[PDB]
Design a protein around this ligand. Structure first.
Ligand code: HEM
Ligand code: HEM
Ligand code: DAO
Ligand code: DAO
Lengths: 393, 393
């Protein structure tokens, strides 16, 4: 317990642009005690260096499961135990039930369908000459893809969106509480309706049959929490990827022109976007399961640790000229998806969605431009991006 | 125990060029029960898929501590417990002793010296007009860099090399163990020469003080074995990266000419070598501590797992047109340094050692060329490289 820097006190220059602070801090060291901005201005360690971001993602002394300390956060209570709030051996078991669904091989078999979705959205959007890229394009593609994968297409997406939006960028203690208890219910309703059809040849179908079987493979509260995460992690991350993409592209016409000149560079741009504006700014819940250290810095048992994945993406030791967006940038290991046991299950899917989305849009909009200012940034440290992206072509 | 892909049945073809075989296996699936080529032909699961390689490296069910199942290899007993034969918490305790020395900040401080060393090696070497690159350049640089770092002042480099070479590629039973004891003699005596000397501020200094202040933080057995791993891992890998690098460039003249023409590309180029001819072909000892699955293949408890890193580097689904060497390659996440708790401690160092070496040399030898046939490949699944590389300039 000592000198805290309150990130609130940087105002909203820091929400809009966290990097010159991240940098300032990274020069002073790799790890520092921090109160995050309001609302729900949380405190604990922030990791801002790559090498330490990487290594703390792998450190077996960091836990994600607070019930081992007697604490029991909301999402745990109302959703259940899910992938990001458990450690091995339960992590392993729950993970094994869904890994085969999300391999490169299987994800590639969705290409034609993701392409077809993208074509219909651009068809629908193009003729009106201008729009919110999010409502019109970048939201519906992932939320349609993930609902089809599960599969549950007649879902109320708008209720879903708003609940999902709240739980990843909480506006306050009550709203948060409300949305969690509202989504728990919605999910309970959803699962039952899926149980009430029979021949569900799909991951949630498979998942409901697994729970019903009297192995501890999958509990009822785990089944709810699985679908919570599959649906939510699919959604805001990928919307933001696609949107941060186009946004940074159009704020860097050098590179965009470079890219249209040679569309083989496309995938290398996506990787630069993921480095430079990675949709997950700050990694999810971790605390010290024992006394340990990260820099020279002693972290005591109990302290939370927050790994700055976007902070690491602009480490100059790892990424020379970190504040420059270069497609032709030298192979450039980032941490946008994590590392270690909880490395993103959706990475191949995300990469596919985002690549197909961005190619098709750029092919079908030679004159795409901003028009003009982008919408509100959600609150909290989890998500990096904007809710509305007004665009024209 | 079931079907065995005997890797020996392929002959010297495989040892020379394993990639077409890896590709044939990977096309069937990503994991296979194998028999390593002779000598001391060994059985286990070889992982040949990128996605499965990453997961396996992070999987908490694989152990590297054979003692936990009543089995002691020549390295463990004779050298001691060191970083690649322990799991957490022993691993966590040992790695803490040394992480601070191998950081990016600290490594970069060595750039003047590594350069100075690279130049001394080239000034001496360049007038003779031709040389074995290994004896004259690639070997001495890493063995010098690491020795200073420790710092073991004057080293018998001709003896150490032979010992080290043998334990990293064993030729037979009698030679292997002999090398371990002959090497276990030298380290002990290297350790005591340091013990019997004026205390100064370097890693071995700090290590030996820790041994003396024993609260099980560092046992003398572990002290030998730490000095073992750092000297040995420091040397084979880096020599082989420098060598693999020069040789791949000279067998691919367009790409070299592209690099000669634009030396900013060097770094991408180096990362492409690591992907294409990674010095560590197959990662070190791992076994299943409980029964598991890897690509939907059932792994019994006790089965060895061999994670094929170079195999992963030619995986079509992670790297398109994998058997093309492309200085301009894009998104290209490889696994040449591992992943998870045991990720290379020395990667920023290796990258630095290699980059200096390749630049200085390429800048001072504009008509560098092969002359003619390269040396023999050592045996075993650990090292991918040749042991004598004759060049001219
Ligand atoms: C589009 C960009 C995406 C990014 C940047 C991203 C990023 C991440 C990150 C950083 C984590 C780990 C965070 C931590 O360790 O605390 C993660 C985990 C996860 N992601 Fe994603 N993700 C993306 C897309 C997806 C998609 C499409 C899905 C599902 C369809 C998904 C499902 C998950 C799941 C289930 C986890 C938890 C894994 C575990 O604990 O074992 N992600 N993602
Ligand atoms: C030149 C290229 C290098 C490559 C490709 C390389 C590769 C690797 C790989 C793949 C591992 C993990 C193997 C496994 O999980 O079984 C590893 C571990 C290690 N490497 Fe390297 N390495 C290199 C250079 C170095 C250097 C220069 C040093 C020391 C100065 C070093 C020290 C280590 C150590 C100490 C470990 C063990 C880490 C642990 O168990 O926690 N390496 N390296
Ligand atoms: C500061 C907000 C943290 C809230 C933790 C719960 C979020 C669950 C959704 C995770 C999505 C993802 O990991 O990509
Ligand atoms: C199964 C392989 C075990 C080999 C034991 C020898 C250890 C040599 C250390 C080199 C480690 C590395 O560079 O990855």
């Amino acid at each position: 317990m000592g000198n805290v820097i309150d990130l609130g006190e940087y105002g909203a220059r820091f929400t809009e642009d966290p990097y010159p602070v991240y940098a300032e801090l990274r020069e002073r060291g790799p790890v520092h005690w921090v109160r995050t901005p309001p609302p729900e201005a949380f405190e604990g360690w922030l990791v801002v260096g790559h090498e330490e971001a990487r290594a703390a993602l792998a450190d077996p002394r960091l836990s994600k499961d607070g019930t081992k300390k007697g604490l029991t956060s909301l999402d745990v209570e109302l959703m259940g135990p899910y992938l990001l709030v458990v450690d091995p051996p339960e992590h392993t078991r729950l993970r094994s039930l869904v890994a085969r669904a999300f391999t490169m091989r299987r994800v590639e078999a969705l290409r034609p369908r993701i392409q077809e979705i993208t074509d219909g959205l651009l068809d629908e959007m193009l003729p009106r000459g201008r729009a919110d890229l999010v409502d019109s394009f970048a939201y519906p593609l992932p939320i349609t893809v993930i609902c089809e994968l599960l599969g549950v297409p007649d879902i109320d997406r708008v209720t879903f969106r708003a609940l999902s939006n709240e739980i990843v960028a909480p506006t306050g203690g009550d709203a948060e509480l409300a949305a969690y208890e509202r989504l728990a219910a919605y999910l309970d309703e959803l699962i039952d309706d899926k149980r009430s059809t029979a021949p569900a040849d799909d991951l949630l179908g498979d998942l409901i049959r697994t729970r019903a079987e009297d192995d501890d493979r999958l509990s009822g509260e785990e089944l709810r929490a699985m679908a919570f995460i599959l649906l939510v992690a699919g959604h805001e991350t990928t919307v933001n990827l696609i949107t941060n993409g186009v946004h940074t592209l159009l704020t860097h016409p050098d590179q965009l022109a470079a890219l249209r000149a040679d569309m083989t560079l496309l995938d290398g741009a996506v990787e630069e976007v993921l480095r430079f504006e990675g949709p997950v700014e700050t990694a999810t819940y971790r605390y010290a399961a024992e006394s340990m250290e990260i820099g020279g810095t002693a972290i005591a048992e109990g302290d939370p640790v927050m790994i700055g994945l976007d902070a690491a993406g602009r480490d100059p030791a790892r990424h020379p000229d970190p504040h420059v967006f270069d497609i032709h940038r030298a192979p450039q290991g980032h941490l946008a998806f994590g590392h270690g046991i909880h490395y993103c299950l959706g990475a191949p899917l995300a990469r596919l969605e985002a690549r197909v989305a961005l190619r098709s849009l750029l092919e079908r909009c030679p004159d795409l431009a901003l028009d003009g200012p982008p919408g509100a940034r959600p609150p909290g440290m989890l998500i990096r991006g904007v809710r509305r992206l007004p665009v024209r072509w």
